Write an enzyme that holds these catalytic residues in place. Sequence first.
Site, PDB file in Angstrom:
ATOM      1  N   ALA A  91       0.821  -1.221   0.000  1.00 51.88           N
ATOM      2  CA  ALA A  91       0.000   0.000   0.000  1.00 51.88           C
ATOM      3  C   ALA A  91       0.852   1.268   0.000  1.00 51.88           C
ATOM      4  CB  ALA A  91      -0.948   0.019   1.193  1.00 51.88           C
TER       5      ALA A  91
ATOM      6  N   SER B 219      -5.370   0.360  11.207  1.00 49.94           N
ATOM      7  CA  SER B 219      -5.058   1.745  11.580  1.00 49.94           C
ATOM      8  C   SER B 219      -5.570   2.711  10.513  1.00 49.94           C
ATOM      9  CB  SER B 219      -3.549   1.923  11.764  1.00 49.94           C
ATOM     10  OG  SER B 219      -2.842   1.586  10.581  1.00 49.94           O
TER      11      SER B 219
ATOM     12  N   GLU C 220      -0.296  10.941   7.174  1.00 48.55           N
ATOM     13  CA  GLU C 220      -1.393  10.388   7.986  1.00 48.55           C
ATOM     14  C   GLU C 220      -2.688  11.163   8.014  1.00 48.55           C
ATOM     15  OE1 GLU C 220      -0.073   9.409  11.976  1.00 48.55           O
ATOM     16  OE2 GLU C 220       0.883   7.550  11.325  1.00 48.55           O
TER      17      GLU C 220
ATOM     18  N   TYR D 237       6.329  -1.821  20.775  1.00 50.66           N
ATOM     19  CA  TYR D 237       4.988  -2.234  20.332  1.00 50.66           C
ATOM     20  C   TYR D 237       4.441  -3.470  21.055  1.00 50.66           C
ATOM     21  CZ  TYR D 237       5.078   1.165  16.469  1.00 50.66           C
ATOM     22  OH  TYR D 237       5.117   2.320  15.722  1.00 50.66           O
TER      23      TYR D 237
ATOM     24  N   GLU E 172     -26.498  -6.415  22.417  1.00 45.63           N
ATOM     25  CA  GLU E 172     -26.980  -5.713  23.611  1.00 45.63           C
ATOM     26  C   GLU E 172     -26.172  -4.439  23.834  1.00 45.63           C
ATOM     27  OE1 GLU E 172     -27.076  -8.016  27.247  1.00 45.63           O
ATOM     28  OE2 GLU E 172     -28.493  -9.484  26.450  1.00 45.63           O
TER      29      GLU E 172
END
Lengths: 428, 426, 426
Positions: free
Chosen positions: A90, A131, A174, A215, A245
Amino acid sequence: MRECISIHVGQAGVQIGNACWELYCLEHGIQPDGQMPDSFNTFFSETGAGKHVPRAVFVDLEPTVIDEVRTGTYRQLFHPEQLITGKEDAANNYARGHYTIGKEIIDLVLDRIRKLADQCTGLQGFLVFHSFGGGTGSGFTSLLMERLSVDYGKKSKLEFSIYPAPQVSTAVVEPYNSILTTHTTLEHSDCAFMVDNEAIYDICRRNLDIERPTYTNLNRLISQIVSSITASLRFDGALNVDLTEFQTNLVPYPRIHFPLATYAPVISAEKAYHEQLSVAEITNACFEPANQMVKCDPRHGKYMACCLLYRGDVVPKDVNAAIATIKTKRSIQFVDWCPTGFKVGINYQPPTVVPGGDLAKVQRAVCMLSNTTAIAEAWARLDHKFDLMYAKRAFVHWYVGEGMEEGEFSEAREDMAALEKDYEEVGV
Amino acid sequence: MREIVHIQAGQCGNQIGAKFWEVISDEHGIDPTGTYHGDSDLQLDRISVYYNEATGGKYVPRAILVDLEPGTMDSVRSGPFGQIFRPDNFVFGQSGAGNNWAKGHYTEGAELVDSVLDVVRKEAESCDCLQGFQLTHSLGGGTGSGMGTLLISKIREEYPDRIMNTFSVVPSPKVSDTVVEPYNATLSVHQLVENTDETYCIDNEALYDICFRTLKLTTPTYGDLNHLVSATMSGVTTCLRFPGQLNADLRKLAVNMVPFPRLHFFMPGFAPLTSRGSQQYRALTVPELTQQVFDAKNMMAACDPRHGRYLTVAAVFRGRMSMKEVDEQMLNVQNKNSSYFVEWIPNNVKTAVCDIPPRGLKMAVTFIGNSTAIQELFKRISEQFTAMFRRKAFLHWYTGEGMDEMEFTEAESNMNDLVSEYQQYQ
Amino acid sequence: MREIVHIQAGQCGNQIGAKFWEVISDEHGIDPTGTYHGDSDLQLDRISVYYNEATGGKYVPRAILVDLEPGTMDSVRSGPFGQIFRPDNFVFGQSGAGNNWAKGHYTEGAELVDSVLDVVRKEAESCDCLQGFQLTHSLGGGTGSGMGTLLISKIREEYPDRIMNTFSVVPSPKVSDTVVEPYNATLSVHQLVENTDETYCIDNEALYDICFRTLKLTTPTYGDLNHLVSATMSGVTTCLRFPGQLNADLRKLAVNMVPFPRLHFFMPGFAPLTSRGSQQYRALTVPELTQQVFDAKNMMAACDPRHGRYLTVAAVFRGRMSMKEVDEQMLNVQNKNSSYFVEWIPNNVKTAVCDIPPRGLKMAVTFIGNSTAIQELFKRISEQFTAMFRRKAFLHWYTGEGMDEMEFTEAESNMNDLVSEYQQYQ
Ligand SMILES: Nc1nc2c(ncn2[C@@H]2O[C@H](COP(=O)(O)CP(=O)(O)OP(=O)(O)O)[C@@H](O)[C@H]2O)c(=O)[nH]1
Ligand SMILES: Nc1nc2c(ncn2[C@@H]2O[C@H](COP(=O)(O)CP(=O)(O)OP(=O)(O)O)[C@@H](O)[C@H]2O)c(=O)[nH]1
Ligand SMILES: Nc1nc2c(ncn2[C@@H]2O[C@H](COP(=O)(O)OP(=O)(O)OP(=O)(O)O)[C@@H](O)[C@H]2O)c(=O)[nH]1
Ligand SMILES: [Mg+2]
Ligand SMILES: [Mg+2]
Ligand SMILES: [Mg+2]
């Protein structure tokens, strides 16, 4: 009888997911081999005689992150049909994931999903980890989400998304990514939970007393939270909270479905001996501004609804008291139209702890997923960030190259702007 | 999966490659014959990107070596890891440019290129999915400039959808090798504007500075320089060749650090750089690594970076590191230097982390920056060109190959325009 | 069952045979005396096709050797595996052609042929069921051309129902041995049109090219050429002599690659061709084998194959191979080169696979193609003929044997027509 399908998109999703899987394994007493030396039926299907395969689909456009799982300890847990792999990545771009590269892989996976989904009978709902800032986690997810409304629609969906930080963020483009991917989230996703790395980091530093986190420490933390959502399904407490619910409870309007999580207690092994963990204290911990999973301000915000989920040694007698106390306090405050605003869950099973874990072994634990006007302010600065970037057509040519028309940007920003006022309208 | 064939050109570029290749072999554990002797298993899972697995377990470098004379190819064979290279891939002429871009780009290079244009195709075919080409040459002379330039544009016709890297060496004012640098540079840059995706502008004047003070070396040679330069190359493509907690490949980097179409020239930097004395006493921790990295004198481009602002900034860290330690430092730096980062692109930072470090060193940092201080590098060149071109000096060598005096001003204008693009956003 | 007697003629053809025979013996494991020393049992089940089992376990070659002088037969006896041949089968005259087809075809050859026409009959009788004759000669001179040509047509009267192979060596423009090549070629080709079923047109100019670059041999000789050429022959008839997963004999090949009556001239090719240097570093896998095979410079016919389209294409692979690997490559190639295959005959490919490889090599590929690029080979010849025939030069040698000037134009016309047949379907 009950069942749920997990999906993992992008690198982040993969990374998160492994830890979660490990946790699950630990919980039900299953080694990496997949043979146990019931409750586990939801996530694990017993193949033939003593082979527990997970309800999972890992999508990734690189081979690196997926081949990390194939070579490690959990090589025996999965097989190549479950683990899908691309060729070209990507490349931290929404346009590459959705339009150009996204056509080929999704087709492969949908069939796989069907094969997995039709096998189980009691579909509760989907889980999609990714993300917003990531390339694959934005472009593919949007496509995937769009696809899933055709085949199912009413069947529920959840997503635990890594929200970008204004200060500590590890990629330049971002802002763009977030703005685009939220267009599909509003229409398709039923309720999306949001976590910020910066927020986590602070928690890791202050409470756990480990000034060098990576991480793997965050992933573990996340996994506990995830478990705390699904713990009501797999174990039989005195009172239970299913996913449907929960949805009914927490989400009031069609536009707003963005609650934020929190987890407590989270403390060191040495700190557990001194600190007497009471119920009231833990309740308080969930409402503290320090322990929130997103960079936000509870002091400005107002909770419309928030769902507490206790696991371990808990009974309703003091829970009620705790509830009352919070109501009485004026630092915490609610919207005028909601007099009664809590949904309370209980579980007998104690929360497990991982071999060589940063978290201490505890009796009690809490997880509050609160829908609020605090997170409304979080996107006001995101928009600003985005706008500046866009104002001089920065980084745009790359996007254009991948087949993104110029009006798309216009569509996604305006919509976002419109959304920001909705919160205000609701909270007046 | 995801292969990158390497191209080389010029006297310097070839030399660089010779060392670079060696270093890469060392990193994976390949020996002069080609048979694998390494211990760590992760070196063999991404061996395919830079090495075709041939018959008998003997790996071979996916490379093309080009030159207009046979002189430089002699020492490459006799040196270490010259036997690993395939005999087929060496290409060379019998004529030579003679430090002239006009001879190199049109007459001399175009006869040689048709051999290479057939050789590269085969290489491309061989791998499953090629993702980009690396190219190593100089802009100072005519051989590395004229040939490479000629080549790189014709790749865009066959392979328009692939990423294009170029590792150049631009001229310095003080350490001037040839007289006709301004000319060659002026014309060679023109084609590298529209055809390339990213370019690393290295300069020897800075390298020397780095060597004398930081490394405290009494007798530097070109070998040292080669070693240094190669390190940078190794750094950028580390995420492909090894696994990591946060991986960042070439395409991603390109997307992040190239905001506009015509502004893509970068400046490399490397850390930690330590002498025999500073090896003991320097505390190698992340903060330390950071601070050293952003120093003006630690750069490989001989400029003053603090005259202007960084448009974007990226880094590639190696070895195991805590992320709160890593991601905070950058932020801190940004906070400190609020006058040296562009304001209308908030959050300029990009980070990448690899688990496998360089053999010997614990940690490493490769700094790729994009700044408005590249004006100082080009401005001087432009001035020099003007000085030269006013009197039509050294012109009969270029005009002899069929180049009009307008054709100089066509490229010159373009160069000027390019230069201006930095001063638009400063 | 299924035998093929071999015929030889001319100075070059004989030489080729000498090597070819040796190679075939090596492949099966026959020694100079004739007694079998081999280990692999499948060499002995199809020994009958090229070797009559004589008394005492000593195998003998089913061959006929022809020449118009005794000079060439001296070196064939003294060389390796000259003792295996039968004394009866050697035929030779005392006169000689003198590089003239007129002398060779009518006066000199017709006196010698009546011995051979009796000798071949015996051979035919000997085997159970003969399937075809192989023939090896040249078209450049008069000896191999005139005799062989004379012979081949008279076989069609006795044996009309048998397949006919011809391995020729046509003239080159640069490497011109004799002056009167155009003449000889022009007349010798005429009879090879209607009488033959398939013909392999080899040219030495291409062989030289193949040698210098690919094999990297410093001092080539004719021996090397012979070795090369023989390899091709070995390749075509591999399916008869050994078992396989997909067998393809001669007749099948003929049926597949000859669509029309008059268009049957082929061009041979061989792979893999590797030097001492490229033996180590070249990864011998099917794709690699494929790509090399379809290169213009790898052919044995000195033309440009890419000027026109292949009418048909066939290949004969050797050694164990996966069929999805094999059958896909061809398809891929076809897809790539959509402008270099005829469109109205879709699916041009033919493949064959043998289990027994060549001794030493793992795999091998014999390429037989049919193209419209054979026009370039003939066109030049035609031009040369025209140049010659305009002034009636070198004519009194041909006219002395009773040939009218019309008889040249009769064959010339035919040749022209033949040439045109390629440009009909291009
Ligand atoms: N880092 C290195 N830089 C070098 C080296 N050799 C030369 N140079 C630098 O490169 C410049 C000269 O480059 P080249 O010799 O490659 C010129 P080119 O080969 O393209 O043309 P010809 O010299 O006419 O063949 C010069 O300014 C030097 O400072 C080396 O080994 N390493
Ligand atoms: N591949 C090979 N080609 C050869 C060899 N000897 C010659 N030739 C080629 O063949 C051509 C000459 O062929 P020949 O000598 O057989 C002519 P021919 O015997 O039919 O008539 P005379 O020479 O009058 O007996 C010439 O163009 C050479 O390039 C050889 O040993 N190998
Ligand atoms: N909490 C947490 N965040 C992560 C982790 N890995 C990545 N991230 C965050 O996700 C963002 C990067 O997204 P990636 O998942 O690497 O991108 P992607 O969607 O896989 O796209 P490609 O990298 O191009 O394949 C960064 O802002 C990180 O902070 C993790 O293990 N834990
Ligand atoms: Mg990724
Ligand atoms: Mg040179
Ligand atoms: Mg002769």
